Amino acid sequence: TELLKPRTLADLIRILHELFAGDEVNVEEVQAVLEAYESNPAEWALYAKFDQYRYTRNLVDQGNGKFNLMILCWGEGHGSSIHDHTDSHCFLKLLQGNLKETLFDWPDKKSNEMIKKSERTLRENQCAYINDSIGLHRVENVSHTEPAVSLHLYSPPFDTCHAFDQRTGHKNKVTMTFHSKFGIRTP
Ligand SMILES: [Fe+2]
């Protein structure tokens, strides 16, 4: 063990490599380390590539295959589907701005409105955690004036998930794409 405060994004990545050296994941330790990194915009500007129309996913590190670390850039009003995480751990840390997270239960096979179980505002530097056992969520930048930037870690990596129709609970498979990888736009 001996978790130390990451001094920089680079230092955080190094620490994460250590924490994912094995086949299991200490969720509380990973969350603690992510939370302890104090966002420094100069360190992640390279990855903070926005799109006018929707949020972008910008790959930072491939975690020697154990995890993907990426930065998501949310324009004003940009948000996600209600989605799962494909049997992976998902950590979400705010680097800039605020995001609203809404939780949903897994739908029953009957077609019904998905009612929100709860919501919270994730603030700068806070780190949230979700997995399929916890439930489903939507993440949204509700701000009209401030873009948000978040750092996401998923283990194992996954590039598909399901989006859920809020009116019915019906799910559709979605393939996730990257806007950039290692600072390089990937069209
Ligand atoms: Fe998510």
Side-chain angles (χ1 to χ4, degrees):
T1 318
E2 196 202 45
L3 311 181
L4 286 176
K5 183 186 157 77
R7 304 170 32 259
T8 64
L9 179 57
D11 203 37
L12 174 63
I13 291 165
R14 199 260 310 158
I15 293 160
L16 294 170
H17 289 334
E18 296 172 4
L19 290 175
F20 287 85
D23 299 325
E24 299 291 310
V25 179
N26 190 317
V27 170
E28 294 82 11
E29 285 181 355
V30 175
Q31 191 165 348
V33 166
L34 290 162
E35 177 122 357
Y37 166 61
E38 285 181 0
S39 177
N40 181 354
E43 292 171 0
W44 53 254
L46 180 65
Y47 309 109
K49 300 179 200 297
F50 285 73
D51 181 86
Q52 188 182 343
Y53 306 106
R54 59 152 293 167
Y55 74 93
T56 58
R57 304 167 81 251
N58 301 281
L59 187 63
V60 177
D61 194 82
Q62 277 170 329
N64 307 137
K66 286 281 180 58
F67 69 79
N68 283 347
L69 187 69
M70 63 189 77
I71 283 176
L72 272 60
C73 297
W74 312 77
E76 292 95 335
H78 290 177
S80 82
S81 57
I82 295 174
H83 62 272
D84 60 3
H85 302 85
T86 310
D87 289 309
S88 289
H89 303 285
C90 188
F91 304 81
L92 193 162
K93 183 211 168 68
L94 269 293
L95 299 180
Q96 172 187 296
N98 299 279
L99 292 168
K100 180 173 90 148
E101 183 194 34
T102 307
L103 293 211
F104 291 89
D105 284 326
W106 282 93
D108 303 309
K109 280 182 176 178
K110 200 181 199 74
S111 172
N112 277 116
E113 168 86 20
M114 308 179 70
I115 304 288
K116 52 202 67 183
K117 160 176 49 180
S118 61
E119 61 185 67
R120 56 169 169 169
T121 296
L122 303 170
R123 308 193 173 278
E124 175 191 277
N125 287 307
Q126 298 187 341
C127 184
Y129 172 73
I130 191 157
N131 67 40
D132 290 349
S133 76
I134 296 174
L136 304 172
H137 77 174
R138 192 198 294 280
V139 175
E140 298 174 279
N141 182 11
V142 299
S143 188
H144 294 255
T145 54
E146 298 300 341
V149 181
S150 54
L151 178 71
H152 297 231
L153 186 160
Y154 302 118
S155 184
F158 61 96
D159 47 26
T160 66
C161 73
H162 303 92
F164 295 75
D165 167 20
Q166 192 176 346
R167 306 285 80 96
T168 60
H170 174 77
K171 76 177 190 287
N172 286 119
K173 200 166 185 183
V174 166
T175 304
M176 283 169 296
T177 57
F178 289 114
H179 188 63
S180 71
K181 292 184 207 196
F182 321 111
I184 307 298
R185 183 73 178 82
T186 52

